[PDB]
């Protein structure tokens, strides 16, 4: 039996880190109770809402 | 009367959803300059159509 790596704890924190990210972005998402918050999330959402929003104004 | 009807008549050239007119009829039963479409279904062709009349 090897013991110079554990790959299952390897595997475990490879899955918790990319879901912990994106709890992250959820936290940062619903704290600012708010969907798009930054480019990448929806670009065409965010423009038409910012185009909109001038329009508002 | 004639001051209503040119009010009328910038509303219908002020119509603004998306920076697209809407007033004009763009979209009417002999629309040629484009079309309409609601993608409404998971796939390419689940595709339909809404059509709007000339408001001048």
Do not use: C, Y
């Amino acid at each position: 039996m090897i013991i110079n790596h554990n790959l299952a704890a390897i595997n475990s924190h490879r899955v918790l880190k990319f879901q912990n990210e994106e709890v992250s972005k959820n936290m940062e998402k619903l704290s600012s109770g708010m969907r798009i918050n930054r480019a990448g999330d929806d670009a065409s959402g965010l423009a038409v809402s910012e185009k909109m929003r001038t329009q508002v104004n | 009367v004639s001051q209503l009807i040119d009010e009328v008549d910038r509303i219908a050239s002020q119509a603004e959803f998306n920076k697209m007119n809407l007033l004009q009829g763009d979209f009417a039963r002999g629309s040629r300059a484009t079309s309409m479409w609601f993608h409404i279904g998971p796939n390419m062709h689940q595709r339909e159509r809404v059509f709007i009349a000339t408001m001048t």
